[PDB]
Design a protein around this motif. Structure first.
Motif, PDB file in Angstrom:
ATOM      1  N   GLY A 170       0.841  -1.196  -0.109  1.00  0.00           N
ATOM      2  CA  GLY A 170       0.088   0.010  -0.036  1.00  0.00           C
ATOM      3  C   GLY A 170       0.730   1.135   0.220  1.00  0.00           C
ATOM      4  O   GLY A 170       0.066   2.243  -0.029  1.00  0.00           O
ATOM      5  N   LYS A 171       2.191   1.219   0.137  1.00  0.00           N
ATOM      6  CA  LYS A 171       3.006   2.419   0.036  1.00  0.00           C
ATOM      7  C   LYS A 171       3.449   2.422  -1.560  1.00  0.00           C
ATOM      8  O   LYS A 171       3.101   1.616  -2.570  1.00  0.00           O
ATOM      9  CB  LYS A 171       4.464   2.195   0.694  1.00  0.00           C
ATOM     10  CG  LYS A 171       4.190   1.967   2.217  1.00  0.00           C
ATOM     11  CD  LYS A 171       3.256   3.122   2.780  1.00  0.00           C
ATOM     12  CE  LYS A 171       3.485   2.801   4.393  1.00  0.00           C
ATOM     13  NZ  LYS A 171       4.661   3.382   5.105  1.00  0.00           N
ATOM     14  N   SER A 172       3.840   3.593  -1.735  1.00  0.00           N
ATOM     15  CA  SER A 172       4.458   4.182  -3.161  1.00  0.00           C
ATOM     16  C   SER A 172       5.560   2.945  -3.631  1.00  0.00           C
ATOM     17  O   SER A 172       6.214   2.593  -2.763  1.00  0.00           O
ATOM     18  CB  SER A 172       4.795   5.422  -3.492  1.00  0.00           C
ATOM     19  OG  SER A 172       6.007   5.658  -2.558  1.00  0.00           O
ATOM     20  N   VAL A 173       5.599   2.767  -4.852  1.00  0.00           N
ATOM     21  CA  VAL A 173       6.801   2.088  -5.488  1.00  0.00           C
ATOM     22  C   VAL A 173       8.145   2.849  -4.994  1.00  0.00           C
ATOM     23  O   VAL A 173       9.221   2.207  -4.688  1.00  0.00           O
ATOM     24  CB  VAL A 173       6.663   1.582  -6.876  1.00  0.00           C
ATOM     25  CG1 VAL A 173       6.875   3.043  -7.764  1.00  0.00           C
ATOM     26  CG2 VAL A 173       7.937   0.763  -7.393  1.00  0.00           C
ATOM     27  N   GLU A 174       8.249   3.889  -5.077  1.00  0.00           N
ATOM     28  CA  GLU A 174       9.502   4.961  -4.676  1.00  0.00           C
ATOM     29  C   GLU A 174       9.745   4.753  -3.208  1.00  0.00           C
ATOM     30  O   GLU A 174      11.177   4.232  -2.912  1.00  0.00           O
ATOM     31  CB  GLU A 174       9.145   6.426  -5.065  1.00  0.00           C
ATOM     32  CG  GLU A 174       8.751   6.619  -6.255  1.00  0.00           C
ATOM     33  CD  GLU A 174       7.463   6.667  -6.968  1.00  0.00           C
ATOM     34  OE1 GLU A 174       6.623   6.390  -5.979  1.00  0.00           O
ATOM     35  OE2 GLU A 174       7.397   6.958  -8.130  1.00  0.00           O
ATOM     36  N   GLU A 175       8.823   4.676  -2.358  1.00  0.00           N
ATOM     37  CA  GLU A 175       9.302   4.574  -0.895  1.00  0.00           C
ATOM     38  C   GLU A 175       9.679   2.982  -0.620  1.00  0.00           C
ATOM     39  O   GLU A 175      10.810   2.809   0.142  1.00  0.00           O
ATOM     40  CB  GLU A 175       8.084   4.864  -0.052  1.00  0.00           C
ATOM     41  CG  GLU A 175       8.378   4.609   1.534  1.00  0.00           C
ATOM     42  CD  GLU A 175       7.350   4.894   2.524  1.00  0.00           C
ATOM     43  OE1 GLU A 175       6.543   5.625   2.075  1.00  0.00           O
ATOM     44  OE2 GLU A 175       7.352   4.509   3.722  1.00  0.00           O
ATOM     45  N   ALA A 176       9.007   2.074  -1.412  1.00  0.00           N
ATOM     46  CA  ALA A 176       9.301   0.531  -0.953  1.00  0.00           C
ATOM     47  C   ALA A 176      10.847   0.471  -1.644  1.00  0.00           C
ATOM     48  O   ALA A 176      11.495  -0.224  -1.046  1.00  0.00           O
ATOM     49  CB  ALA A 176       8.206  -0.265  -2.010  1.00  0.00           C
TER      50      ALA A 176
ATOM     51  N   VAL B 265      10.447  -3.592 -11.013  1.00  0.00           N
ATOM     52  CA  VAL B 265       9.052  -3.740 -10.800  1.00  0.00           C
ATOM     53  C   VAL B 265       8.053  -4.056 -11.889  1.00  0.00           C
ATOM     54  O   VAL B 265       8.555  -4.063 -13.063  1.00  0.00           O
ATOM     55  CB  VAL B 265       8.845  -1.878 -10.946  1.00  0.00           C
ATOM     56  CG1 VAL B 265       7.592  -1.676 -10.811  1.00  0.00           C
ATOM     57  CG2 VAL B 265       9.725  -1.352  -9.754  1.00  0.00           C
ATOM     58  N   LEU B 266       7.069  -4.974 -11.644  1.00  0.00           N
ATOM     59  CA  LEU B 266       6.265  -5.706 -12.606  1.00  0.00           C
ATOM     60  C   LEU B 266       4.729  -5.402 -12.143  1.00  0.00           C
ATOM     61  O   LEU B 266       4.560  -5.002 -10.951  1.00  0.00           O
ATOM     62  CB  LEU B 266       6.369  -6.975 -12.237  1.00  0.00           C
ATOM     63  CG  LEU B 266       7.982  -7.794 -12.756  1.00  0.00           C
ATOM     64  CD1 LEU B 266       8.203  -9.163 -12.078  1.00  0.00           C
ATOM     65  CD2 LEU B 266       8.371  -7.480 -14.065  1.00  0.00           C
ATOM     66  N   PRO B 267       4.041  -5.604 -13.063  1.00  0.00           N
ATOM     67  CA  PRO B 267       2.303  -5.346 -12.631  1.00  0.00           C
ATOM     68  C   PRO B 267       2.021  -6.342 -11.985  1.00  0.00           C
ATOM     69  O   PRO B 267       2.439  -7.569 -12.237  1.00  0.00           O
ATOM     70  CB  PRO B 267       1.730  -5.289 -14.037  1.00  0.00           C
ATOM     71  CG  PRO B 267       3.048  -5.197 -15.119  1.00  0.00           C
ATOM     72  CD  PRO B 267       4.197  -5.577 -14.443  1.00  0.00           C
ATOM     73  N   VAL B 268       1.169  -6.220 -11.105  1.00  0.00           N
ATOM     74  CA  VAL B 268       0.598  -6.961  -9.901  1.00  0.00           C
ATOM     75  C   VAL B 268      -0.362  -8.128 -10.939  1.00  0.00           C
ATOM     76  O   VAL B 268      -1.027  -7.366 -11.943  1.00  0.00           O
ATOM     77  CB  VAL B 268      -0.341  -6.526  -8.987  1.00  0.00           C
ATOM     78  CG1 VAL B 268      -1.661  -5.692  -9.420  1.00  0.00           C
ATOM     79  CG2 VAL B 268      -0.525  -7.799  -7.937  1.00  0.00           C
ATOM     80  N   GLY B 269      -0.715  -9.248 -10.646  1.00  0.00           N
ATOM     81  CA  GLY B 269      -1.354  -9.986 -11.538  1.00  0.00           C
ATOM     82  C   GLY B 269      -0.781 -10.499 -12.923  1.00  0.00           C
ATOM     83  O   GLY B 269      -1.454 -10.795 -13.851  1.00  0.00           O
TER      84      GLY B 269
ATOM     85  N   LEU C   2       9.011  -6.149  -7.223  1.00  0.00           N
ATOM     86  CA  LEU C   2       8.088  -5.503  -6.702  1.00  0.00           C
ATOM     87  C   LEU C   2       6.805  -5.525  -7.605  1.00  0.00           C
ATOM     88  O   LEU C   2       6.852  -4.957  -8.583  1.00  0.00           O
ATOM     89  CB  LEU C   2       8.415  -4.121  -6.461  1.00  0.00           C
ATOM     90  CG  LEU C   2       9.639  -3.654  -5.553  1.00  0.00           C
ATOM     91  CD1 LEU C   2       9.905  -2.276  -5.203  1.00  0.00           C
ATOM     92  CD2 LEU C   2       9.044  -4.151  -3.887  1.00  0.00           C
ATOM     93  N   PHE C   3       5.573  -5.790  -6.962  1.00  0.00           N
ATOM     94  CA  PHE C   3       4.482  -5.997  -7.836  1.00  0.00           C
ATOM     95  C   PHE C   3       3.456  -4.576  -7.293  1.00  0.00           C
ATOM     96  O   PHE C   3       3.176  -4.583  -6.418  1.00  0.00           O
ATOM     97  CB  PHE C   3       3.751  -7.342  -7.298  1.00  0.00           C
ATOM     98  CG  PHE C   3       4.348  -8.445  -8.134  1.00  0.00           C
ATOM     99  CD1 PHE C   3       4.201  -8.722  -9.428  1.00  0.00           C
ATOM    100  CD2 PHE C   3       5.299  -9.102  -7.218  1.00  0.00           C
ATOM    101  CE1 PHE C   3       4.839  -9.845  -9.916  1.00  0.00           C
ATOM    102  CE2 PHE C   3       6.012 -10.279  -7.866  1.00  0.00           C
ATOM    103  CZ  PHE C   3       5.712 -10.664  -9.196  1.00  0.00           C
TER     104      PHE C   3
ATOM    105  N   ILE D  35       2.384  -0.450  -4.060  1.00  0.00           N
ATOM    106  CA  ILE D  35       2.792  -1.975  -3.803  1.00  0.00           C
ATOM    107  C   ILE D  35       1.502  -2.689  -3.452  1.00  0.00           C
ATOM    108  O   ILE D  35       0.780  -2.219  -2.670  1.00  0.00           O
ATOM    109  CB  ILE D  35       3.788  -2.049  -2.645  1.00  0.00           C
ATOM    110  CG1 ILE D  35       5.090  -1.190  -3.034  1.00  0.00           C
ATOM    111  CG2 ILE D  35       3.875  -3.626  -2.283  1.00  0.00           C
ATOM    112  CD1 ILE D  35       5.873  -1.810  -4.263  1.00  0.00           C
ATOM    113  N   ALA D  36       1.327  -3.773  -4.175  1.00  0.00           N
ATOM    114  CA  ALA D  36       0.192  -4.479  -4.114  1.00  0.00           C
ATOM    115  C   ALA D  36       0.179  -5.858  -3.490  1.00  0.00           C
ATOM    116  O   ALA D  36      -0.665  -6.733  -3.378  1.00  0.00           O
ATOM    117  CB  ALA D  36      -0.777  -4.481  -5.653  1.00  0.00           C
ATOM    118  N   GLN D  37       1.322  -6.354  -3.436  1.00  0.00           N
ATOM    119  CA  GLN D  37       1.762  -7.774  -2.870  1.00  0.00           C
ATOM    120  C   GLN D  37       2.981  -7.585  -1.857  1.00  0.00           C
ATOM    121  O   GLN D  37       3.926  -6.627  -2.144  1.00  0.00           O
ATOM    122  CB  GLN D  37       2.052  -8.396  -4.007  1.00  0.00           C
ATOM    123  CG  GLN D  37       2.461  -9.799  -3.855  1.00  0.00           C
ATOM    124  CD  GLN D  37       2.486 -10.539  -5.226  1.00  0.00           C
ATOM    125  OE1 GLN D  37       1.575 -10.491  -6.014  1.00  0.00           O
ATOM    126  NE2 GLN D  37       3.581 -11.377  -5.327  1.00  0.00           N
TER     127      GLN D  37
END
Ligand SMILES: [Ca+2]
Ligand code: NA
Lengths: 281, 63
Positions: B9-15, B30-34, B48-49, B56-58
């Motif tokens: 649930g955080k941004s990809v940047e913070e992750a 970085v890859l799309p979730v699903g 990172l999905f 972040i979704a996963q």
């Protein structure tokens, strides 16, 4: 000189080879990132790409599909490694791009191509945590059509009592394969769950890499093609056996290891699978 | 540290920032979730999905 990677010996593939059976005339689709067809230790018979921006299935921009292919079918000669089923007819069905990922629709299109092209075995060293109806329908269709479908269980390790097997391995119609090392110990990353079916070597597995290279990779991705290659050996010795029978032969002749939650039925033994009468060793 | 459930649930940047503090040599993709991905295990990699908003979704994990 050629080397036989330990995992090929561990599943007792050399016993089939000495009987004279090497997967001849069996069509195996590696549904993956492509296969480098220029590698001198591989012979690719055909294929197709479902990746919109990478239209050549014989160019592997990731390396993963080439490594998986070598475990299935690296050639029997005086170089490199030896595959489980070194005479198999190998098809590159490219559904993953350079970054290792693919859309569900690309994987499904690859499975449909395999069915339309009369593949005997599909290996999918790939997965994701969620299913889809269309994915389940494509694997169920392949199996209904007579194809042996083998997939990596996933590398999600443990999570208490929960299953961590990914899709499509998690579907009942697909044989889900976990990873052991050379001592038959489950790899710590190997997925677990009641859907885990059998185990095969998946730690430090030497195989073909693009640009005429070799290297050791780890993963349930590496374990799956031992089982897909074993299915090809079995069908080369018993060409009329159905996918149902090949699948039962592998399940019914494993060497049992630990609890089935962690090990499924145990390590495959293709020597025992390819006999008429089956029991566990 | 090999999993980061606090990053969902955080941004990809913070992750990315957090993962590189814990694991500075990480190879982050970085890859799309699903999507479906290769089943090899890479101790140096963190996938990172992300969802369509780039959050972040996963749960990120090494592998
Ligand atoms: Ca060879
Ligand atoms: Na399954």
């Amino acid at each position: 000189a050629q080397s036989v990677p330990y995992g090929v010996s561990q599943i007792k593939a050399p016993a089939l080879h000495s009987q004279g059976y090497t997967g001849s005339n069996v069509k195996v689709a590696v549904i993956d990132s492509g296969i480098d067809s220029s590698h001198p230790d591989l012979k690719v018979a055909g294929g197709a790409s479902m990746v919109p921006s990478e239209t050549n299935p014989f160019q592997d921009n990731n390396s993963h599909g080439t490594h998986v292919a070598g475990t299935v079918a690296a050639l029997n000669n005086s170089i490199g490694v030896l595959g489980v089923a070194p005479s198999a007819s190998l098809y590159a069905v490219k559904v993953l791009g350079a970054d290792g990922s693919g859309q569900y629709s690309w994987i499904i299109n690859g499975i449909e191509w395999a069915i339309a092209n009369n593949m005997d075995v599909i290996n999918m060293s790939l997965g994701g945590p969620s299913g889809s109806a269309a994915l389940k329908a494509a694997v169920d269709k392949a199996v209904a059509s007579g194809v042996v479908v083998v997939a990596a269980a996933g590398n999600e390790g443990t999570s208490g009592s929960s299953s961590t097997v990914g899709y499509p391995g998690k579907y009942p119609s697909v044989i889900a394969v976990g990873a052991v090392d050379s001592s038959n110990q489950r790899a710590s990353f190997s997925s677990v769950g009641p859907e885990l079916d059998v185990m095969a070597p998946g730690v430090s597995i030497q195989s073909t890499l693009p640009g005429n290279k070799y290297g050791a990779y780890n993963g349930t991705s590496m374990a799956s093609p031992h089982v897909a290659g074993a299915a090809a050996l079995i069908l080369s010795k018993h060409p009329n056996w159905t996918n149902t029978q090949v699948r039962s032969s592998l399940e019914n002749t494993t060497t049992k290891l630990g609890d089935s939650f962690y090990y499924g039925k145990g390590l495959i033994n293709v020597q025992a699978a390819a006999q008429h009468h089956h029991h566990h060793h | 540290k090999t999993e980061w459930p606090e990053l969902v649930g955080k941004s990809v940047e913070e992750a990315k920032k957090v993962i590189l503090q814990d694991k500075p040599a990480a190879q982050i993709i970085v890859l799309p979730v699903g999507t479906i991905v290769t089943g090899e295990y890479r101790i140096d990699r963190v996938r990172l999905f992300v969802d369509r908003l780039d959050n972040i979704a996963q749960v990120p994990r090494v592998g």
